[PDB]
Amino acid sequence: KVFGRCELAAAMKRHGLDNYRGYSLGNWVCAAKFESNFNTQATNRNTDGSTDYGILQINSRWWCNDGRTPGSRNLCNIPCSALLSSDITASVNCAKKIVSDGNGMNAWVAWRNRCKGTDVQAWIRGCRL
Ligand SMILES: [Cl-]
Ligand SMILES: [Cl-]
Ligand SMILES: [Cl-]
């Protein structure tokens, strides 16, 4: 599913991501924009052989099981395929664990490089939330 901008903001809020660990909704929408362009089916293969999955490009080295990332963990206790669903529940619940791991949203390199320090509220501007 490719979400609309406000549609995704609303879904993220519904699932308790808004201001989670102090990160406003615009941060999460911005991260999703640059990780996946709001496409739940997004996948990308990393140089180390791990793969990133879903709207927030959650990585199989630590967070989910895909059966093909040697030496990896599955800390969200989910198949990586769950992160591709039109229902963002699994991605949100896993993201909550990731952002609580110590480095906040810096875990998402694209958030650090493209969202951090910017006017992230622009991502939810105009949205009925
Ligand atoms: Cl915001
Ligand atoms: Cl594996
Ligand atoms: Cl980047």
Ligand 2 centre from 52 Cα, in Å?
13
User: Annotated catalytic residue: which of 7, 35, 66, 87?
Assistant: 35
Residue type at position 125: R
- CA dist 88 and 113 (Å) reads 24
Domains and CATH numbers, the chain: 1-129 (1.10.530.10)
* Structure letter (DSSP) for residue 71: T
Tell me if 59 sits within 8 A of 80, measured CB to CB. Answer: no
Q: Give the determination technique.
A: X-ray
52 catalytic? Reply is yes
Looking at the DSSP assignment, which residues form a beta bridge with residue 53? Answer: 43, 58
Residue 77 CB neighbour total at 10 angstroms: 13
Would the CA dihedral through 20, 123, 30, 10 be positive or negative? positive
Residue 97 contacts residue 76 (beta carbons within 8 Å) = yes
